[PDB]
Amino acid sequence: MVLLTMIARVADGLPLAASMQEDDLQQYQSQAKQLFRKLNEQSPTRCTLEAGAMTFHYIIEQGVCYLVLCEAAFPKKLAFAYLEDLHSEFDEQHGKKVPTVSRPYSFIEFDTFIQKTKKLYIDSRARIMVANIEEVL
Amino acid sequence: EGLRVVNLLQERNMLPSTPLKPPVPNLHEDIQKLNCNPELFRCTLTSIPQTQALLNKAKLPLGLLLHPFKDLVQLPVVTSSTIVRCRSCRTYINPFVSFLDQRRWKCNLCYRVNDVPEEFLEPHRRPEVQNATIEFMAPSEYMLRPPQPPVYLFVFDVSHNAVETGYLNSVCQSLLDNLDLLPGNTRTKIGFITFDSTIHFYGLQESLSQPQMLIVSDIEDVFIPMPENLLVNLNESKELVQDLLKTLPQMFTKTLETQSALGPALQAAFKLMSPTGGRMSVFQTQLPTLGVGALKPREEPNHRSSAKMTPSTDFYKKLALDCSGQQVAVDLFLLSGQYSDLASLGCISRYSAGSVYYYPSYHHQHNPVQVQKLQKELQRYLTRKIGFEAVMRIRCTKGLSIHTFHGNFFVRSTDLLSLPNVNPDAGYAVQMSVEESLTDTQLVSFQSALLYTSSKGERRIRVHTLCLPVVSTLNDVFLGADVQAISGLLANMAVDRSMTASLSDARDALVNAVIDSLSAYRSSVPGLMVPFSLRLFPLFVLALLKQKSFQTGTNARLDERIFAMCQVKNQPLVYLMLTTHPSLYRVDNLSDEGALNISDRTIPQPPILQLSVEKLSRDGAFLMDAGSVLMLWVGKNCTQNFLSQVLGVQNYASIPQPMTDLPELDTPESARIIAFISWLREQRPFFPILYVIADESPMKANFLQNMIEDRTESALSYYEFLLHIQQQVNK
Amino acid sequence: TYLEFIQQNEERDGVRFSWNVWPSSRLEATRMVVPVAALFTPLKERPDLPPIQYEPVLCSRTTCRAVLNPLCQVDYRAKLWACNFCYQRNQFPPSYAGISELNQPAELLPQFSSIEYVVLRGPQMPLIFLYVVDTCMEDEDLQALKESMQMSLSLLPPTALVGLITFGRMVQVHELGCEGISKSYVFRGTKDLSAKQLQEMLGPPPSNRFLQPVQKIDMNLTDLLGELQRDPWPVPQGKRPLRSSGVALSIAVGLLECTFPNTGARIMMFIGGPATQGPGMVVGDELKTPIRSWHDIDKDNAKYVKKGTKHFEALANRAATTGHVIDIYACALDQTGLLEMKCCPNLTGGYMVMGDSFNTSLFKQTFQRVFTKDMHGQFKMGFGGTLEIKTSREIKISGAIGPCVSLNSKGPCVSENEIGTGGTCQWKICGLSPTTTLAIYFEVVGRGAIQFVTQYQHSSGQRRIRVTTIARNWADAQTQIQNIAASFDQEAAAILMARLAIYRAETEDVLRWLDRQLIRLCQKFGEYHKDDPSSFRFSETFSLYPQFMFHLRRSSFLQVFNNSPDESSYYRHHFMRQDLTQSLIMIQPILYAYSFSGPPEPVLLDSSSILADRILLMDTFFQILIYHGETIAQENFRHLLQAPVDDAQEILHSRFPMPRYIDTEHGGSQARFLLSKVNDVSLQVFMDHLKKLAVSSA
Ligand SMILES: O=C(O)CCCc1ccccc1
Ligand SMILES: [Zn+2]
Ligand SMILES: [Zn+2]
């Protein structure tokens, strides 16, 4: 019930915002970028991938992909609610500038809202498709 | 100019009155006008020897000195959606490539022809070929992780001696004054740790009435006491960190903690920064004695002990490598009044791309010079630009191989350098050799490329490219010699020689460099005959031998010599020359032959004097530019007009003992000397304090320790040194 | 009247013996069915006795050294007295030189048997309170816990010292009042610490940086307690919070052990859930696995019990040796781990409070009874009690059962056969109240004598010595068992026998020993023809002993199942401390009946007493329940509907552990508590089987 969260433009896979804390990240970050590369305009808008002890969850809105990784034991019900909170905030704040930027991580300052929202889901006190990721890759 | 030969025994006044200028590589007119700025990139031999045999005959070290992250006046920023890079050696498209097919370019470093992609548009007019210095926008594949935010963690020693030094007050004051001026956007994080015999964390939550001091006393087993509010967001918690900085100096006034557990404290600060990385500022005031990383006391040498350096442990070397692997850089602020084994503590910054700052015998009341020096150096340290999680690679045309690196970094694989931080005041040096004969080419090029994360969260690449010609004549190699660059490369080599062998071998290798080169010159041509490019070679090497890094008979202490060597390894070439051979001017009679052009100011240009007491005068006053300071020495029989109109005093006896700076009086003589001084400190981003304290009896006449041409009781004079060299040249 | 005798001797001497006439021969001492024992209350209150402000006289004999008592034979002419225990004759001290017949000292008068002296040992130490606070609980529980701790701070004496230790994943020792900075020392709740380690890592009346006078610190503590926030470490899905109860307690113990050893100190620990990490771990952090139950421990499916119990057992002895009191206040929905931590408040004089949440009237009011004061504004608690018992040369002490620890003192009054905490003439009771009752078991190896001497630290700081000297008649050789059978205290024996059974169950069949003595007592003192069960009768002195045994062998003290282990250890804890009357209420709850036809009247604990047109009031010592029959479950009807509610409120205040109040009726789920205490299966059947064996072989 952990972390990895990325927001990327579906067209070219251009990263827009992310958030990662360790104290590996190297392997599942590649897989995350492999998925951004494969996603196109015929991809399922909401999907879940299985990667052994891990599990990817993503949605797609306005050509923008909201990917999250966690241990498979993390509730898939909560994973999509976490991405929905990110989408509505991101589209409201930067949805009209996304198809114009070209730099990687042109919205690093979205780091703040990701992590303050991230903690509202990784604490039990605070209170679709499925396919093996090795296939799509 | 001059292809002329010089006799060092007859001139004896060879130093020029105007500042030295770096040599111009003997290149075609159109190539040299695009060449790299010599301040950022320069070579000891502007005419590269064609073969290693020729290089050995010259008996001169071949290498490069670079200042890659220097503050620039104008920087071209290419935002290309594609970075053209040679498909073989990954060399960036530089102004010195060879465009042939107008759609194919020949790599000037590995000679492979590459295809100009149809994104390159009149392909030879693109900015990547019109600027040797240029900064790229790194794509998505040039970063291992999202750009890390700027993280600043300050670590203060609060032992009994540290509280006595009073450093904690002004440091917390400088942070309060420059809190908004720290490089970073809204992602900036800030933290604090104090320590004595225990580690003291500090949490900062807006829900609590005051910060909380979380003490971990398990010295042999450190941990992080809280997961959230130790490294806090500076933007959101500006108010919380301001109170703590106003409260920190008052928390330890009555301390009895005589010991310091610096080792475990640095392990605590590493674990806190390991998740994200960043810059770690450590303020230490005494020998570490408690816990792991403790060091034993040493007895300071005297003028009598011979040349009989290295770290006494590897803990701080290992700990630096751990910080380097987590993109953490450590900067050491040593304000010690006694021996502290800096030869060991320095390893925390040498292998993490940091830098050590030394303030000997710091005291808030007793030592007003070190107080203002720390203030002005903290001003630069807190407001200069910074790059995070950086790496650098130095490329050079096939046939030239780099084999030794000099500077604060960690070399991973060959021709690579790990820079947890990269600061605009760091200098680097590289020693190379001719692995394959340069019969093919007549031009060789060098390229350094700095991949880093900006304070605004943007991956960038700064690329410099230098191009030089190849020669095959011994005299041609001598004609392109850069005496300053050779002196700087020899200093870095001599420091390594000390750690690897002894100070004696280091001094001998320096002396043998002048002998073997001038004897090789003589064997290919009565007095001491040198080419025009090396007329200042023995002078600068002698000044190198009297510098606090390699001097012997001086009463210098241990940490002084070590810090002197840490500056040699980490300073750009200019400040090494200014420290080794300071510029001495006479300032009690300035007038107009000055560079007024500046609008409303006139700015006198007095002639540079050679470093000898024979040039001084008791009738006047003399200013010495040591690079980092500006000592103004006043004569005893000094004129009365200089006393009342420049110093603000009626006689020599009432010149205040420690004078922190000149007054700005309503006199034309004050306006002239204030203009000459301010012009000096404008040539540098590190504000040098100026103390007139250098009277004829202040017991602070280390102004005279820089008179490197006179003889002392334990060193030769410049004329004696010339006499010793000639005896060896034609032995 | 023997009943007037038992009443007046408990009111005066705070003691009730199983036999008030003792076997004068070796042939009857060995054949005693119920051992000669005493329900001794060392600090019982009474009609304002005079505090003797002078040091007690003692016997001048190295071994004996008893206290001058009314049994002593005096000689006001020669200024000499003869000790009743060892016949040694003493000289009166100089302060007794003006002794006279028509004005003699207080201890001698038979009214001033059981008297208290006040002695001066110099400066009196300040009292010490150490709050140990859990931070792993809900906000409404933590906010209520904070308010309760702030209220207790307003009652503490200005001289007393206070210390705050909060914990969760880590343990925090707070250095009080360091002005504008608020510090604390952080320790991993993963590895234990000894006192010497904790002393090195941390560092006119005395005080530490961690223990400061209330009058100088009460404002900073009441603010820190007001800012205490829940454990900052997040709790992932399906996981319990990381709670280091075992190390937090050991750090609280080691702190006082190296700062103020051998002085009144109270370690008040507050728990919101079980210990999940470290030594003393009670259950894992996986919500999938439940906390152990009695079924789990019987089938060897509880891997933390013995290892965790051993940890808190060594902590209990560490604090009891140092002389410090360990309180435990646990409120949660799940279990807490009282079974593993029971020894800390049992071996010391520590309290044990249990509820569902700190945010209830149940915990809030129970917590402020702890600091109830008497007619001088001082707490009704004593510290560091030392109980020493002098006996005649014919009496020996087997041992004691109750909140005490052996000082392992050897002497001729020690018996070979030891019982409970035995093999000693001296016991230490780190905490005691006017209610603490030890069970002392004697053995005979004409007027016997027993002298109880209790030295303790008072709430005022004064050192006091309670001296109670009782005397019971030796049996007449020509009327041995007839007098013994007349001096029988059926109530006191039933609890003293219950004390033994429970102590054997909690330190493991027990019902078998309880029956073989019930049958033996029926045969020796009952009336019957052999092989004729219908002939069996019992004297009015013995008739209630069978019924007290029926309820005892069916109570929740010995039938642990259908209860949680924490509930079982909580029930045993209070039964091993209470006096006679309250202990009878536990074993056999009292039941009152309320109807139009007559004022409130007590009725039998039988199903025949549950009428439809009647309101019942059952008083289990742990719960006060009001039952409404099917009829009444709907000004005259009001007098009835609130007659039990009125009588409930009165007793609903005196009792220290405030009993859980219950309002139920016929068909309600909470009526189960009445049907289980009511009603082998039936008394009638139990009595018949008892009579068939009583008239049968011996
Ligand atoms: O392997 C590499 O050289 C590419 C990554 C490091 C680097 C980046 C930019 C410039 C120089 C070096
Ligand atoms: Zn190439
Ligand atoms: Zn006696």
Short mmCIF file of N, CA, C and O in Angstrom, two decimals, chain C residues 261-320:
data_model
loop_
_atom_site.label_atom_id
_atom_site.label_comp_id
_atom_site.label_asym_id
_atom_site.label_seq_id
_atom_site.Cartn_x
_atom_site.Cartn_y
_atom_site.Cartn_z
N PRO C 261 14.95 6.32 43.76
CA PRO C 261 14.65 4.97 44.26
C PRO C 261 14.27 5.00 45.73
O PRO C 261 14.77 5.81 46.52
N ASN C 262 13.34 4.11 46.08
CA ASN C 262 12.88 3.91 47.45
C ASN C 262 12.17 5.16 48.00
O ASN C 262 12.59 5.77 48.98
N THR C 263 11.08 5.52 47.32
CA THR C 263 10.25 6.66 47.71
C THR C 263 8.97 6.60 46.90
O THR C 263 8.97 6.17 45.74
N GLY C 264 7.87 7.01 47.53
CA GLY C 264 6.56 7.04 46.90
C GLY C 264 6.54 7.68 45.53
O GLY C 264 6.79 8.88 45.38
N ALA C 265 6.24 6.87 44.52
CA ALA C 265 6.17 7.33 43.14
C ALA C 265 5.11 6.51 42.41
O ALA C 265 4.99 5.31 42.63
N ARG C 266 4.34 7.18 41.55
CA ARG C 266 3.20 6.58 40.88
C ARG C 266 3.39 6.66 39.37
O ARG C 266 3.42 7.76 38.80
N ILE C 267 3.50 5.50 38.73
CA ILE C 267 3.64 5.40 37.28
C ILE C 267 2.25 5.16 36.71
O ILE C 267 1.72 4.04 36.76
N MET C 268 1.63 6.21 36.18
CA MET C 268 0.29 6.15 35.62
C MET C 268 0.40 5.96 34.11
O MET C 268 0.75 6.90 33.39
N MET C 269 0.11 4.76 33.64
CA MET C 269 0.18 4.44 32.22
C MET C 269 -1.23 4.39 31.63
O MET C 269 -2.16 3.88 32.25
N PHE C 270 -1.36 4.94 30.42
CA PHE C 270 -2.65 5.03 29.73
C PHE C 270 -2.52 4.37 28.37
O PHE C 270 -1.63 4.72 27.59
N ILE C 271 -3.40 3.41 28.10
CA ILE C 271 -3.29 2.54 26.93
C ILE C 271 -4.56 2.67 26.09
O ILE C 271 -5.67 2.67 26.63
N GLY C 272 -4.38 2.76 24.78
CA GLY C 272 -5.50 2.78 23.86
C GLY C 272 -5.58 1.54 22.99
O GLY C 272 -6.46 1.42 22.14
N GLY C 273 -4.65 0.60 23.21
CA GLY C 273 -4.61 -0.62 22.44
C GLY C 273 -3.43 -1.50 22.82
O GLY C 273 -2.57 -1.11 23.62
N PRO C 274 -3.37 -2.70 22.24
CA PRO C 274 -2.36 -3.67 22.67
C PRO C 274 -0.96 -3.29 22.20
O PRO C 274 -0.77 -2.50 21.27
N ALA C 275 0.03 -3.87 22.88
CA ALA C 275 1.43 -3.70 22.50
C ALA C 275 1.71 -4.53 21.25
O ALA C 275 1.66 -5.76 21.29
N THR C 276 2.00 -3.82 20.16
CA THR C 276 2.29 -4.41 18.88
C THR C 276 3.74 -4.48 18.37
O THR C 276 3.98 -4.95 17.32
N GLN C 277 4.68 -3.95 19.09
CA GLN C 277 6.05 -4.05 18.68
C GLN C 277 6.96 -4.02 19.85
O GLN C 277 6.81 -3.20 20.71
N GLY C 278 7.92 -4.91 19.89
CA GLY C 278 8.91 -4.89 20.94
C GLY C 278 8.79 -5.91 21.99
O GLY C 278 8.01 -6.76 21.85
N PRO C 279 9.61 -5.85 23.02
CA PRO C 279 9.48 -6.77 24.13
C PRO C 279 8.17 -6.47 24.78
O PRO C 279 7.90 -5.32 25.06
N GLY C 280 7.42 -7.49 25.13
CA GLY C 280 6.12 -7.24 25.69
C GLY C 280 5.04 -7.16 24.66
O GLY C 280 3.96 -6.74 24.92
N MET C 281 5.35 -7.60 23.45
CA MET C 281 4.44 -7.57 22.33
C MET C 281 3.37 -8.52 22.65
O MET C 281 3.63 -9.58 23.09
N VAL C 282 2.14 -8.11 22.42
CA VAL C 282 0.98 -8.93 22.68
C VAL C 282 0.28 -9.54 21.49
O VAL C 282 -0.32 -10.56 21.60
N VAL C 283 0.35 -8.88 20.36
CA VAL C 283 -0.21 -9.37 19.10
C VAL C 283 0.53 -8.68 17.96
O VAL C 283 1.13 -7.62 18.15
N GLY C 284 0.48 -9.28 16.77
CA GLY C 284 1.10 -8.69 15.61
C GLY C 284 0.30 -7.52 15.06
O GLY C 284 -0.81 -7.22 15.48
N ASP C 285 0.91 -6.84 14.08
CA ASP C 285 0.31 -5.66 13.47
C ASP C 285 -0.60 -5.99 12.29
O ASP C 285 -1.01 -5.07 11.58
N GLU C 286 -0.91 -7.26 12.08
CA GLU C 286 -1.81 -7.67 11.01
C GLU C 286 -3.23 -7.75 11.56
O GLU C 286 -3.51 -8.57 12.44
N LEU C 287 -4.13 -6.91 11.04
CA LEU C 287 -5.52 -6.93 11.47
C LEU C 287 -6.21 -8.25 11.14
O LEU C 287 -7.27 -8.53 11.70
N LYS C 288 -5.63 -9.05 10.25
CA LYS C 288 -6.23 -10.34 9.90
C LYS C 288 -6.26 -11.27 11.10
O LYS C 288 -7.24 -12.01 11.30
N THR C 289 -5.21 -11.25 11.92
CA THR C 289 -5.10 -12.12 13.09
C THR C 289 -5.66 -11.42 14.32
O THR C 289 -5.23 -10.31 14.64
N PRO C 290 -6.61 -12.02 15.03
CA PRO C 290 -7.18 -11.38 16.22
C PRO C 290 -6.30 -11.57 17.44
O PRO C 290 -5.42 -12.43 17.49
N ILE C 291 -6.55 -10.73 18.45
CA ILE C 291 -5.87 -10.87 19.73
C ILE C 291 -6.26 -12.22 20.34
O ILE C 291 -7.37 -12.72 20.15
N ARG C 292 -5.32 -12.81 21.08
CA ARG C 292 -5.52 -14.14 21.63
C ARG C 292 -6.73 -14.18 22.56
O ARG C 292 -7.06 -13.20 23.23
N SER C 293 -7.39 -15.33 22.59
CA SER C 293 -8.50 -15.61 23.48
C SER C 293 -8.14 -16.79 24.37
O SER C 293 -7.11 -17.45 24.18
N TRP C 294 -9.00 -17.06 25.36
CA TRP C 294 -8.78 -18.22 26.22
C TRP C 294 -8.77 -19.51 25.40
O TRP C 294 -8.01 -20.44 25.71
N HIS C 295 -9.61 -19.59 24.36
CA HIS C 295 -9.57 -20.75 23.47
C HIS C 295 -8.23 -20.83 22.75
O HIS C 295 -7.70 -21.93 22.54
N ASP C 296 -7.67 -19.68 22.36
CA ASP C 296 -6.40 -19.68 21.64
C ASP C 296 -5.24 -20.11 22.54
O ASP C 296 -4.33 -20.81 22.09
N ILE C 297 -5.27 -19.70 23.81
CA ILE C 297 -4.16 -20.04 24.70
C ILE C 297 -4.23 -21.50 25.12
O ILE C 297 -3.20 -22.13 25.40
N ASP C 298 -5.44 -22.08 25.17
CA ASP C 298 -5.56 -23.48 25.54
C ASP C 298 -5.12 -24.41 24.42
O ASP C 298 -4.63 -25.51 24.68
N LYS C 299 -5.26 -23.98 23.16
CA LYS C 299 -4.84 -24.76 22.01
C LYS C 299 -3.47 -24.32 21.48
O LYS C 299 -3.13 -24.64 20.34
N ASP C 300 -2.70 -23.59 22.29
CA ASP C 300 -1.33 -23.21 21.96
C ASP C 300 -1.27 -22.43 20.65
O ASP C 300 -0.46 -22.71 19.76
N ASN C 301 -2.14 -21.43 20.54
CA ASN C 301 -2.23 -20.56 19.37
C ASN C 301 -2.10 -19.10 19.80
O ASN C 301 -2.91 -18.24 19.45
N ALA C 302 -1.07 -18.81 20.59
CA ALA C 302 -0.85 -17.46 21.10
C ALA C 302 0.65 -17.33 21.42
O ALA C 302 1.07 -17.56 22.55
N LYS C 303 1.43 -16.97 20.40
CA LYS C 303 2.89 -17.03 20.50
C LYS C 303 3.50 -15.87 21.27
O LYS C 303 4.71 -15.89 21.52
N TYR C 304 2.71 -14.86 21.66
CA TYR C 304 3.25 -13.69 22.34
C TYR C 304 2.98 -13.69 23.84
O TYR C 304 3.59 -12.88 24.55
N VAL C 305 2.10 -14.56 24.33
CA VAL C 305 1.63 -14.46 25.71
C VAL C 305 2.79 -14.62 26.69
O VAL C 305 3.10 -13.70 27.46
N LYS C 306 3.44 -15.78 26.68
CA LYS C 306 4.45 -16.07 27.70
C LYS C 306 5.65 -15.14 27.59
O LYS C 306 6.18 -14.68 28.61
N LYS C 307 6.10 -14.84 26.37
CA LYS C 307 7.23 -13.94 26.21
C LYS C 307 6.87 -12.52 26.63
O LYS C 307 7.69 -11.82 27.24
N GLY C 308 5.64 -12.09 26.34
CA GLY C 308 5.21 -10.77 26.77
C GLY C 308 4.92 -10.71 28.26
O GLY C 308 5.24 -9.73 28.93
N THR C 309 4.30 -11.77 28.80
CA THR C 309 4.04 -11.83 30.23
C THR C 309 5.34 -11.77 31.02
O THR C 309 5.43 -11.07 32.04
N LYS C 310 6.37 -12.50 30.56
CA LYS C 310 7.65 -12.50 31.26
C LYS C 310 8.29 -11.12 31.28
O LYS C 310 8.95 -10.76 32.26
N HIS C 311 8.10 -10.34 30.22
CA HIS C 311 8.68 -9.00 30.17
C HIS C 311 8.07 -8.09 31.23
O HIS C 311 8.80 -7.46 32.01
N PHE C 312 6.74 -8.02 31.28
CA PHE C 312 6.08 -7.18 32.28
C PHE C 312 6.22 -7.75 33.69
O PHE C 312 6.10 -6.99 34.66
N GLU C 313 6.46 -9.05 33.82
CA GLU C 313 6.67 -9.63 35.15
C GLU C 313 8.00 -9.18 35.73
O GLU C 313 8.09 -8.91 36.94
N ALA C 314 9.04 -9.10 34.90
CA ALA C 314 10.32 -8.58 35.37
C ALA C 314 10.24 -7.08 35.63
O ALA C 314 10.93 -6.58 36.53
N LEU C 315 9.43 -6.35 34.86
CA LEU C 315 9.20 -4.94 35.15
C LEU C 315 8.46 -4.77 36.46
O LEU C 315 8.74 -3.84 37.23
N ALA C 316 7.49 -5.65 36.74
CA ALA C 316 6.74 -5.57 37.98
C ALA C 316 7.66 -5.71 39.19
O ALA C 316 7.56 -4.94 40.15
N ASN C 317 8.57 -6.69 39.15
CA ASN C 317 9.49 -6.88 40.26
C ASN C 317 10.51 -5.76 40.34
O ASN C 317 10.92 -5.37 41.44
N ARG C 318 10.94 -5.23 39.20
CA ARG C 318 11.87 -4.11 39.20
C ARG C 318 11.27 -2.90 39.92
O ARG C 318 11.93 -2.27 40.75
N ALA C 319 10.01 -2.58 39.61
CA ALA C 319 9.37 -1.45 40.26
C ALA C 319 9.01 -1.77 41.71
O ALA C 319 9.14 -0.91 42.59
N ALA C 320 8.54 -2.99 41.97
CA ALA C 320 8.19 -3.37 43.33
C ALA C 320 9.42 -3.44 44.23
O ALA C 320 9.33 -3.16 45.43
#
